[PDB]
Each structure stands twice: as C-alpha cells, then as structure tokens.
C-alpha cells in the first residue's frame, strides 16, 4: 500500500485530536447553532450552561432526561476528554451517548434538543465519533433544516454515500435519495439493528414508524422486478416485522402489518411462512386499530396464496387462536362492511376449519355463505366437506338447511359433487332422511 | 389592398414549405414519393406515436 494511504488511515484515527491551534479551530468551529466565527471563540463553560438549561427544559417535558445530568451533563464532563480515555471508558461513554440519542430522537423539533445536543457535539465530538447513530436517530427529519445542519457539520460513513452531494447544499435530500439510501442490504442490516434497539427500549414513535414503513415499502417496490433481491429481502424485513409484531405498541404492529401486506403482494410466499406470520400477528394483538388492520392483513395474505393447499382448512391451534382473537359476530360485520376487500380464500378456509373443528356453528357457515359470493371450486370444496360431515355427524338439521341452500344456488354442482363421491341424489336423501331434490 | 393579399399568400406558401421541412426533421418512418410531375412528397408509415 501507499505511504499516503497509510497516512490517511493515521489521519482518520487521529481526526479529533487538537494537535495545534489550527486543528483546534477547525474542530471547535463545528456547531449546530452558531456560525464558525462565534463557535471558535466560545469556551466549554458557556456551552455547558446553555446545554444544562436545555436539559432542564427537556427534563420538564420528558422526565427520563434527568438521568443524564449525572453522567453526560454533569459538571465533571467539562474536563472529560475522549482521547485520554481507554477503550472501556470510551465504550461506556458511547453507550450513554447512544441512549441519549435514542431518547432525543423524537424531540428534535423542539428548541432545547438542539442546545442540549450542542454539548455532545462540542465536548464529545459525536458528529465525528458517533456519526451513524446520530444519522439513524435524526434520519426522519430530512425535510427539516436541523438535518441540514447535522449534514453540514457531519462526516459521512461508508454506508451513507447517497447523501454525499447533499452536504453543504441548500436543497434538502429527496425521497428518491432516501430510497436509494435504504436500497442497500448492509444499510438495511444496520437500520434493523437500530430498530431492534428502539423496540427493545420502547423508543419508537409515529413519525419514525411512518418514515421507516414508507422506506421499506418503497425498497420492496424498487426491488420487485428482481427476484434475487426480493429473496435476499425476505429475512431482513420479515425479522423486523416479527420484532415489530412482538412490540406492545399498536403503531409498531400496524407498521408490521403494512410491511407484511406489501411484501406478500410483491413476492409469492410459502404457505408455512404465511401461516407463521398469521400466528405471530394473532399472538400479540390487543388494540382495536391493530385488530382492524390485522384482519385485512390476514385476508390479503390468504388471497396471495396460489398453491395446491390454497383453500385448505387452518390448523387447529391457529384456528382456535383466530377464534379467540376475532369473534364470530366480528367476522359477520366485517362481511357487512361496505368496503369488503377480496377475502374468499380466507373465508373458505375459515368455513372448512369451522366444519372440521367447531361442529356447532353450521348456521354461521350458512350466514357467511349467504353474505359472501364464493367461486365454484371453493363451493365444491365446501360441499364435499359438508358431505363428509353429513356421513360423520349424527344430527342432520344444521347440515340439511345448508343443503337446501345449496340446492337453491347451484344445484347441479351438488349433483356433480355427489356423482364424484359416488352417491346418487336419492341416496343422499336417505342419508339426510329428507327429500331435498326436485 | 391587393398587394396585402399577394404578400399574405406568398408568406403562406413560404411557411408551408418551412413546416414541411420541420416535419421531416422529426421522429418517424417516412417514404419519399416522387410524382411524375416532379413534386416531392413524403408519406409516413402507419405507426402509432408511443
């Protein structure tokens, strides 16, 4: 390698060290508020007073900010220099900085956040040393001028290279630039680690979740014509969807619902994966908007399926979990809803699962089949299952009522089902102990 | 008034010739058709503008 390349590595290692007056000036002029002229003349005490006032206001707004007054915004931190610390002490300081940035991500629209983050910018050089966490925490605000100020004073990591032309520019980054930023796989791994930390520490909020959901959905849409890129996108996005579903936050759950719906529409997934995602959706479901989104998600996920086991009944555990979460009258009023997204595959699988397991809501099966319009293959599968159930079950009444309904609508399909099963219509009349045929 | 009419029709013929050449400059498949009288015409292919 070149001597110049090795010296470049040396310079990158000793970037923040103020080895003389000019380096001190260049490092200290970087600020989120003041210009370079004022910033060079300011000392640490003045910035510390303003940052302590800002942290007092931040603690009055959010009480969790008061824990940082003993560790980062204390009076002892004025004389703490990073470069004379060891690696363990720098690691502890980095953990504290990460926790502060995670907590301060939501409040960046407030004025005290900027004045309090001045102290971390100027004492602890986070725009040089904690750059990635700063960008990931403030990445939602790319319209706003505070992100412009961060971009102006910041250095860029390797993973943030789509923003290289938006440094020191009046025009903000665009939505296409953010999509191109997210479209990298390693950036997605870094961002899913960040979201894992946010979900683990309960720091997710609505503007963040809307931004990440829109970016993930647009990444899926951009990769929709490459099946290899989509196949690589399966683990990252489905792990982060599982983690968002594990959250207690209904906004996190709705974000995971959106990701699952778009991603299932873009890529035809295995039925095992669809059923496992449905189990994960149904497991931690406790809020009303989450239920409303989750039912539509389940209907769309089942409408996606096109394999041989397409219309097959649910497994017993998943069916009982669905029955516990979503109730019969809720299914009925979901069909009464005027919007009514296409859900015939899920409704038919639900009907066959009811006939397999419950054995007591055959009139509910009748009501569902009256309210939804099913296709011939689905009706044929339902009719065959009901014929088997008529052979098994001792009581015929709940089933025979369904069978006059099936004579009323598509009688010839019932005849062909009986012929396929080897039964004559009069033999089925003997089975039902009632004459139902013309 | 008659001279105004003559200038107007002369400018009309000039503009028609310019517009014919400006249509040749564009994008399409065209065929040169030479009449027996000697007039030069161009006929375009039956193709729809994308």
């Amino acid at each position: 390698s070149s001597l110049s390349d090795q010296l470049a590595q040396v310079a990158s290692n000793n970037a923040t060290v103020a080895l003389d007056r000019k380096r001190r000036q260049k490092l200290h002029s970087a600020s989120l508020i003041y210009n370079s002229k004022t910033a060079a003349t300011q000392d640490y005490d003045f910035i510390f007073e303003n940052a302590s006032k800002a942290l007092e206001e931040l603690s009055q707004i959010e009480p969790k900010f008061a824990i940082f007054s003993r560790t980062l915004f204390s009076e002892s931190s004025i004389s703490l220099d990073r470069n004379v610390q060891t690696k363990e002490e720098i690691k502890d300081l980095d953990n504290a900085i990460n926790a502060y940035l995670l907590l301060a991500s939501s409040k960046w629209y407030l004025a005290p956040t900027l004045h309090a983050t001045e102290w971390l910018v100027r004492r602890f050089q986070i725009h040089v040393k904690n750059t990635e966490m700063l960008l990931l925490s403030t990445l939602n605000y790319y319209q706003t001028p505070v992100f412009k100020r961060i971009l102006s004073i910041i250095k860029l990591p390797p993973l943030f290279n789509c923003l290289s032309n938006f440094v020191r520019s009046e025009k903000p980054p665009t939505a296409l630039t953010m999509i191109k930023l997210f479209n990298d796989m390693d950036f997605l791994k870094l961002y899913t680690s960040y979201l894992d930390q946010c979900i683990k520490h309960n720091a997710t909020y609505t503007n963040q979740l809307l931004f990440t959901t829109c970016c993930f959905i647009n990444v899926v849409a951009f990769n929709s014509n490459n099946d290899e890129k989509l196949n690589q996108l399966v683990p990252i996005l489905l792990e982060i969807s599982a983690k968002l579903l594990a959250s207690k936050s209904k906004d996190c759950q709705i974000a995971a619902h959106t990701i699952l719906v778009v991603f299932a529409t873009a890529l035809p997934l295995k039925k095992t994966i669809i059923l496992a995602a449905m189990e994960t959706i149904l497991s931690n479901l406790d809020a009303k908007e989450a239920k409303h989104s989750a039912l539509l998600t389940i209907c769309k996920l089942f409408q996606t399926l096109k394999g041989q086991g397409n219309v097959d009944q649910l497994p017993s555990k998943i069916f009982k979990l669905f029955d516990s979460k979503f109730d019969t009258v809720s299914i009925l009023t979901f069909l009464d809803k005027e919007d009514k997204p296409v859900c015939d595959k899920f409704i038919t699988s639900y009907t066959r699962s009811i006939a397999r397991y419950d054995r007591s809501k055959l009139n509910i099966i009748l009501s569902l089949l009256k309210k939804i319009r099913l296709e011939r293959y689905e009706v044929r599968l339902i009719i065959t299952d009901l014929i088997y159930l008529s052979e098994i079950l001792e009581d015929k009444s709940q089933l025979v009522e369904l069978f006059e309904y099936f004579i009323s609508i598509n009688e010839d399909l019932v005849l062909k089902c009986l012929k396929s099963l080897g039964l004559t219509g009069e033999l089925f009349e003997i089975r039902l102990t009632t004459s139902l045929f013309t | 008034v008659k001279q105004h009419l003559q200038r107007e029709t002369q400018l009309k013929q000039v503009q028609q010739r310019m517009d014919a050449q400006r249509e040749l400059l564009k994008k399409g498949s065209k065929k040169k058709i030479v009449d027996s009288s000697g007039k030069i015409s161009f006929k375009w292919k039956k193709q729809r503008k994308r």
């Binding site: 032309n165 665009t174 296409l176 191109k180 | -």
Partner: protein, 102 residues
C-alpha cells in the same frame, strides 16, 4: 375572449413586448407572462418554472373555458380544484427529481 384564447397565449399574456421582439428578431421567446405571479410557479424552482407555467396555463384554460361557457355552474370551483391537484402532482414530481448523481 380569454376563454377562446388557447393555453399558449394564456401562458405568455402580459409579455407581449419581449414576445414580439423575439418573434421579429429570431430570438428566444418568454417562458411566461403574468402567470409568473401565481403561487405554484413561485414554488417551482430553476428550469421547472417554465414547465409549471406551461402546465398551469393549460389547466387554467380548461378551468376558464368551463367557467365562462358552462350554463349551469355551482360557484364552488371544483374543476379548478381538480386541476390544481393535477398541477400539484406535476410540481411534486418535478421537484422530487434531482440532477446531481447520488
């Protein structure tokens, strides 16, 4: 008369001096006229100002012909609102495009 004028006239209305000196001296014509003071053209930047002027002149011609020639009109400006929505879609597309390489 403003309804019977086409959209290309409505774009350059008020810039007749520059328009006709350019048309008489074989120079470049104005990109816009009185419509430079509409709010949407102001939101446009750079080369997108002429594009938004062209789009807005076309939609203004549509809305203004409707506004003059309709026998039955509800005085709500719904045609104007739909055309404004279309112009805002076009403006958002033009502004979201960037020229520097990422």
């Amino acid at each position: 008369s403003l309804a019977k004028s086409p959209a290309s006239t409505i774009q350059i209305l008020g810039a007749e001096k520059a328009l006709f000196r350019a048309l008489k001296t074989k120079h470049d014509t104005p990109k816009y006229g009185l419509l430079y003071h509409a709010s949407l053209v102001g939101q446009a930047t750079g080369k997108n100002k002429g594009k938004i002027a062209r789009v807005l002149a076309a939609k203004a011609a549509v809305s203004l012909r409707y506004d003059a020639l309709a026998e039955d009109r509800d005085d709500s400006g719904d045609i104007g609102l739909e055309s404004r929505a279309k112009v805002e879609n076009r403006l958002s597309q033009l502004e979201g495009r960037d020229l520097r390489t990422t």
